[PDB]
Coordinates of C-alpha atoms in Angstrom, one line a residue:
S1 CA 0.4 -96.9 -97.8
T2 CA -0.9 -100.1 -99.2
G3 CA -0.1 -103.8 -100.7
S4 CA -2.3 -105.6 -103.6
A5 CA -1.3 -109.0 -104.7
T6 CA -2.6 -111.7 -106.7
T7 CA -3.8 -115.3 -104.9
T8 CA -3.6 -118.2 -107.5
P9 CA -5.5 -121.4 -106.4
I10 CA -2.8 -123.9 -106.4
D11 CA -4.7 -126.9 -108.5
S12 CA -8.1 -127.6 -110.2
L13 CA -9.9 -128.2 -106.6
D14 CA -8.5 -124.8 -104.8
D15 CA -7.0 -126.8 -102.1
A16 CA -4.8 -123.8 -101.3
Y17 CA -3.9 -120.3 -102.6
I18 CA -0.7 -119.0 -103.4
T19 CA 0.6 -115.6 -103.0
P20 CA 4.0 -114.0 -104.1
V21 CA 6.2 -112.3 -101.8
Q22 CA 9.4 -110.7 -101.6
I23 CA 11.8 -112.0 -99.0
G24 CA 15.6 -110.4 -98.3
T25 CA 17.8 -107.9 -100.9
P26 CA 17.7 -108.4 -103.6
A27 CA 14.7 -110.1 -103.4
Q28 CA 14.0 -113.5 -103.0
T29 CA 10.0 -114.1 -104.3
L30 CA 8.3 -116.9 -102.8
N31 CA 4.9 -118.3 -103.2
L32 CA 3.2 -118.1 -99.5
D33 CA 0.0 -119.6 -98.3
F34 CA -1.6 -116.9 -96.9
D35 CA -3.0 -117.6 -93.2
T36 CA -5.9 -115.9 -91.5
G37 CA -6.0 -119.0 -89.1
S38 CA -2.3 -118.9 -88.1
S39 CA -0.2 -116.3 -87.1
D40 CA 3.6 -117.7 -88.3
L41 CA 5.7 -116.5 -91.0
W42 CA 7.5 -119.2 -92.1
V43 CA 9.5 -120.7 -95.7
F44 CA 11.6 -123.3 -96.8
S45 CA 15.1 -122.2 -96.7
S46 CA 18.5 -123.2 -97.1
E47 CA 18.7 -124.9 -93.5
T48 CA 15.4 -127.0 -94.5
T49 CA 16.5 -130.5 -94.1
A50 CA 17.7 -131.7 -97.6
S51 CA 15.1 -135.3 -97.9
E52 CA 12.4 -132.8 -96.6
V53 CA 12.8 -130.4 -99.8
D54 CA 10.7 -131.4 -102.9
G55 CA 10.5 -128.9 -105.5
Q56 CA 10.0 -125.9 -103.1
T57 CA 11.7 -122.4 -103.6
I58 CA 13.7 -121.6 -100.6
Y59 CA 14.7 -118.7 -98.8
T60 CA 19.0 -118.4 -98.6
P61 CA 19.3 -115.6 -95.6
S62 CA 22.8 -115.7 -96.3
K63 CA 22.4 -114.1 -100.0
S64 CA 20.5 -111.2 -98.3
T65 CA 22.2 -108.5 -97.4
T66 CA 19.3 -107.0 -95.1
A67 CA 18.7 -110.1 -93.6
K68 CA 20.0 -110.7 -89.5
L69 CA 20.0 -113.6 -87.4
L70 CA 17.3 -112.8 -84.8
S71 CA 19.7 -114.6 -81.7
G72 CA 18.4 -117.5 -79.8
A73 CA 15.1 -117.8 -81.4
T74 CA 13.2 -120.8 -82.1
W75 CA 10.2 -121.6 -83.2
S76 CA 7.9 -125.2 -83.8
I77 CA 4.5 -124.8 -84.8
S78 CA 1.5 -127.7 -84.9
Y79 CA -1.3 -127.3 -87.2
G80 CA -4.6 -128.7 -86.2
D81 CA -4.6 -131.4 -88.7
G82 CA -1.8 -132.9 -87.3
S83 CA 1.3 -131.1 -90.1
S84 CA 4.3 -129.0 -88.5
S85 CA 7.3 -127.4 -89.1
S86 CA 10.0 -126.0 -86.8
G87 CA 13.3 -123.7 -87.0
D88 CA 15.1 -120.8 -86.3
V89 CA 14.2 -117.5 -86.9
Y90 CA 15.8 -114.3 -89.1
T91 CA 14.7 -110.7 -89.5
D92 CA 14.4 -109.2 -93.1
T93 CA 12.8 -107.0 -95.5
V94 CA 9.4 -108.8 -96.6
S95 CA 7.3 -107.0 -99.3
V96 CA 3.3 -107.9 -100.7
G97 CA 2.5 -106.6 -103.2
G98 CA 4.0 -103.3 -103.0
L99 CA 3.9 -103.1 -99.3
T100 CA 7.3 -103.6 -97.6
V101 CA 8.2 -104.3 -93.9
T102 CA 11.4 -104.0 -92.6
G103 CA 12.5 -106.1 -89.6
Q104 CA 9.9 -108.7 -90.5
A105 CA 10.4 -112.1 -88.1
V106 CA 11.2 -114.8 -90.8
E107 CA 11.0 -118.4 -89.5
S108 CA 13.4 -120.4 -91.4
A109 CA 12.1 -123.9 -91.5
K110 CA 15.0 -126.5 -90.4
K111 CA 12.2 -129.7 -90.3
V112 CA 8.8 -129.7 -92.3
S113 CA 6.4 -132.7 -92.6
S114 CA 5.9 -134.9 -95.4
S115 CA 2.8 -132.9 -96.1
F116 CA 4.7 -129.8 -96.6
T117 CA 7.3 -131.5 -98.2
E118 CA 4.4 -133.0 -100.9
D119 CA 2.9 -130.1 -101.7
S120 CA 5.6 -128.1 -103.7
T121 CA 3.4 -125.6 -104.9
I122 CA 4.4 -123.8 -100.8
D123 CA 6.7 -122.2 -100.0
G124 CA 5.9 -121.5 -96.9
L125 CA 2.7 -119.3 -94.8
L126 CA 2.5 -116.0 -93.9
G127 CA 0.2 -116.0 -90.8
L128 CA -2.8 -113.2 -90.7
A129 CA -4.0 -114.4 -87.2
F130 CA -3.5 -112.5 -84.2
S131 CA 0.0 -112.2 -83.0
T132 CA -0.4 -113.9 -79.8
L133 CA -0.6 -117.3 -81.3
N134 CA 2.8 -116.4 -82.9
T135 CA 5.2 -119.8 -82.2
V136 CA 9.0 -118.0 -81.7
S137 CA 9.9 -118.5 -78.0
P138 CA 11.4 -116.6 -76.2
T139 CA 10.3 -113.7 -78.0
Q140 CA 7.2 -114.3 -79.8
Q141 CA 7.3 -112.0 -83.2
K142 CA 4.6 -110.0 -84.4
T143 CA 2.9 -111.0 -88.5
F144 CA 3.3 -109.0 -91.4
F145 CA -0.2 -107.1 -90.6
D146 CA 0.7 -106.2 -87.1
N147 CA 3.9 -104.9 -88.6
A148 CA 2.6 -103.0 -91.6
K149 CA -1.0 -101.7 -89.7
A150 CA 0.4 -98.3 -88.6
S151 CA 1.8 -97.8 -91.8
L152 CA -1.4 -98.7 -94.1
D153 CA -4.1 -95.6 -94.9
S154 CA -6.6 -98.1 -93.0
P155 CA -5.6 -100.8 -90.7
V156 CA -7.6 -103.5 -93.0
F157 CA -6.5 -106.1 -95.2
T158 CA -9.2 -108.0 -97.6
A159 CA -9.4 -111.4 -99.0
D160 CA -11.0 -111.8 -102.3
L161 CA -10.4 -115.7 -102.9
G162 CA -10.9 -117.3 -106.6
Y163 CA -13.3 -120.3 -107.5
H164 CA -11.6 -121.9 -109.6
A165 CA -9.4 -118.5 -110.8
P166 CA -7.2 -116.3 -109.3
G167 CA -8.2 -113.8 -106.4
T168 CA -6.8 -110.8 -104.5
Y169 CA -5.7 -110.2 -101.2
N170 CA -5.3 -106.1 -100.5
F171 CA -3.6 -104.5 -97.8
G172 CA -4.4 -101.1 -96.4
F173 CA -7.8 -100.3 -98.5
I174 CA -10.9 -101.5 -99.3
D175 CA -11.6 -101.8 -103.1
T176 CA -14.8 -101.0 -103.4
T177 CA -15.3 -102.2 -107.6
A178 CA -14.5 -105.5 -106.0
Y179 CA -18.3 -106.6 -104.2
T180 CA -21.8 -106.0 -105.0
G181 CA -23.9 -104.1 -102.9
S182 CA -22.8 -103.7 -99.0
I183 CA -20.0 -105.0 -96.9
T184 CA -21.9 -106.4 -93.4
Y185 CA -19.7 -106.4 -90.5
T186 CA -19.5 -108.3 -87.4
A187 CA -18.2 -108.8 -84.2
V188 CA -14.9 -110.5 -83.6
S189 CA -13.1 -112.2 -80.2
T190 CA -9.9 -112.4 -80.2
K191 CA -9.6 -114.6 -76.7
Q192 CA -8.2 -117.8 -79.0
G193 CA -6.3 -115.8 -81.6
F194 CA -8.2 -116.2 -84.2
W195 CA -10.9 -114.0 -86.2
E196 CA -13.6 -115.6 -84.1
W197 CA -17.6 -114.1 -85.4
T198 CA -20.6 -116.0 -84.9
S199 CA -22.8 -116.5 -88.0
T200 CA -26.4 -116.2 -87.5
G201 CA -27.5 -119.3 -89.4
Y202 CA -27.8 -120.7 -92.3
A203 CA -29.8 -122.6 -95.4
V204 CA -29.9 -125.7 -97.7
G205 CA -30.0 -124.7 -101.1
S206 CA -33.7 -123.0 -101.8
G207 CA -34.8 -124.3 -98.3
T208 CA -35.7 -121.9 -95.2
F209 CA -33.2 -120.2 -93.3
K210 CA -32.3 -121.8 -90.4
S211 CA -32.0 -118.8 -87.4
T212 CA -28.9 -120.0 -85.2
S213 CA -25.4 -118.7 -83.4
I214 CA -22.3 -120.6 -85.4
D215 CA -19.4 -119.5 -83.6
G216 CA -16.0 -120.0 -85.8
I217 CA -12.8 -118.7 -87.5
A218 CA -12.5 -117.5 -90.6
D219 CA -9.6 -119.2 -91.8
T220 CA -8.2 -118.6 -95.5
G221 CA -5.9 -121.9 -94.3
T222 CA -8.2 -124.5 -94.5
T223 CA -10.1 -125.5 -97.8
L224 CA -13.2 -126.7 -96.4
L225 CA -16.4 -125.4 -94.7
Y226 CA -16.3 -127.0 -91.4
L227 CA -19.8 -126.8 -89.3
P228 CA -21.8 -128.3 -86.8
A229 CA -23.2 -132.3 -87.4
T230 CA -26.3 -131.3 -87.5
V231 CA -25.6 -128.4 -90.1
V232 CA -24.0 -130.6 -92.5
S233 CA -26.5 -133.9 -91.6
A234 CA -28.9 -131.6 -93.2
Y235 CA -26.8 -130.1 -96.2
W236 CA -25.8 -133.6 -97.2
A237 CA -29.7 -135.1 -96.6
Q238 CA -30.2 -132.7 -99.6
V239 CA -27.5 -134.9 -102.0
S240 CA -29.1 -138.3 -103.4
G241 CA -26.6 -140.8 -102.4
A242 CA -24.4 -138.5 -100.3
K243 CA -23.0 -140.6 -96.8
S244 CA -20.3 -140.0 -94.1
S245 CA -17.6 -142.1 -94.9
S246 CA -15.2 -143.2 -91.7
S247 CA -12.8 -145.2 -94.2
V248 CA -12.2 -141.8 -96.4
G249 CA -13.1 -139.2 -93.6
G250 CA -16.0 -137.3 -93.9
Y251 CA -19.1 -137.2 -95.8
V252 CA -19.1 -138.4 -100.5
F253 CA -21.2 -138.1 -102.6
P254 CA -22.4 -139.7 -105.9
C255 CA -20.1 -137.5 -108.2
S256 CA -23.4 -137.5 -111.0
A257 CA -25.2 -135.5 -108.6
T258 CA -26.0 -131.9 -108.6
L259 CA -25.1 -130.1 -105.4
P260 CA -27.3 -127.6 -103.9
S261 CA -26.4 -124.1 -102.6
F262 CA -25.2 -123.6 -99.0
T263 CA -25.9 -119.8 -97.8
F264 CA -24.6 -118.7 -94.3
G265 CA -25.8 -116.0 -92.2
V266 CA -23.9 -112.4 -91.3
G267 CA -25.9 -110.3 -89.7
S268 CA -29.1 -110.1 -91.4
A269 CA -27.0 -110.5 -94.6
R270 CA -26.9 -113.8 -96.4
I271 CA -23.6 -115.4 -98.4
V272 CA -24.7 -117.9 -101.2
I273 CA -22.1 -120.6 -101.6
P274 CA -22.7 -122.1 -105.3
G275 CA -23.3 -125.5 -105.2
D276 CA -20.3 -126.1 -107.1
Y277 CA -17.7 -124.4 -104.7
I278 CA -18.6 -127.7 -102.8
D279 CA -17.7 -130.5 -104.7
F280 CA -13.6 -131.4 -104.1
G281 CA -13.4 -134.2 -106.6
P282 CA -13.3 -137.7 -106.9
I283 CA -12.4 -139.4 -103.5
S284 CA -9.2 -140.9 -105.7
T285 CA -8.2 -141.2 -109.4
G286 CA -11.1 -142.9 -111.6
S287 CA -13.5 -142.8 -109.0
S288 CA -17.3 -141.9 -108.8
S289 CA -17.4 -141.0 -105.3
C290 CA -16.9 -137.3 -104.7
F291 CA -15.4 -136.0 -101.4
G292 CA -17.8 -132.9 -99.9
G293 CA -16.8 -129.1 -98.9
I294 CA -18.6 -128.8 -96.3
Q295 CA -17.7 -131.5 -93.4
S296 CA -18.3 -131.6 -89.6
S297 CA -16.1 -129.5 -87.2
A298 CA -17.2 -132.4 -84.3
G299 CA -13.7 -133.3 -82.7
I300 CA -12.1 -130.4 -84.3
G301 CA -13.4 -128.9 -81.1
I302 CA -14.3 -125.4 -83.4
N303 CA -16.0 -124.7 -86.7
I304 CA -13.9 -122.9 -89.4
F305 CA -15.6 -121.1 -92.5
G306 CA -12.5 -122.0 -94.7
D307 CA -12.3 -121.4 -98.5
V308 CA -14.8 -122.8 -99.4
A309 CA -17.1 -120.4 -97.4
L310 CA -14.9 -117.3 -97.9
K311 CA -14.5 -117.8 -101.6
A312 CA -18.1 -116.9 -101.9
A313 CA -17.3 -113.4 -100.7
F314 CA -15.3 -110.0 -100.0
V315 CA -14.1 -110.4 -96.9
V316 CA -12.5 -107.4 -94.9
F317 CA -10.5 -108.1 -91.9
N318 CA -10.4 -104.8 -90.0
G319 CA -7.8 -104.5 -87.6
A320 CA -8.6 -101.2 -85.8
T321 CA -8.0 -101.4 -82.2
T322 CA -11.5 -103.2 -82.0
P323 CA -11.2 -105.9 -84.5
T324 CA -14.4 -106.6 -86.6
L325 CA -15.1 -109.2 -89.8
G326 CA -16.8 -107.6 -92.8
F327 CA -18.5 -109.6 -95.7
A328 CA -20.0 -108.7 -98.8
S329 CA -21.3 -110.4 -102.2
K330 CA -19.7 -110.4 -105.4

């Protein structure tokens, strides 16, 4: 089997992407944030504290003839950025772009933090990291991909995120029309539960490539590109007037600037992030200070190849017995 679904930016800055997902019978369609950096499929629901719902579409298990309470199971997740959610668990039928999994754990939120409430466009998360990070207790549950894997034509999914435009998540096949040149594959460590890999270096603008190993995660649920302070400083040093602002929370730059590209290495291959992809617009409405899309990972504890980086590529998440990651230009 295969599946193919369009993923759409939630706003004009590509702060996140939503993908429609069919849950239950008859189908209830929710727009979920596909997240290769976490491993829980959780949704706003009829059980969510009313004051914490503000415009989201909810899953109502009592209206699904295929929903079953997973007795005794609870879940609770605290994301790196301080957001959180928790609740109980149903199993139900979940379909993504024509690909159907029966008995998928659908984690129903009883509580969500303010960041989730305030984002009316995101109805929940669909985790695509390794199932070892799943938070359901006392019986850990599998991700949608893990459940689908054996049925797929090939045990892969691909992320093709758009810049200020829709893109695609495919399951079970590689669309050879969706990228240019070749796909370069690189090793993955699953030791921390992530799609963790090592970039071979970077360049700033038309500058020379610096060969250096940068370990990090391919994380569709993170907006920005988080890299070591040395690398980030070298980037922003090429933008007149750029500075790191503790008050704002990272590097800012004059909105009148033209940003240089940023290149990252995948083996001997190179992925070029155009300068425009690194512009996250005014820090507040009407400001002439703009927020940067490349930020320091210092004090995160891990480097993160988030949407800024991934949207410059066609990315293969290869879930074979020994997983790997593939990157192509597009």
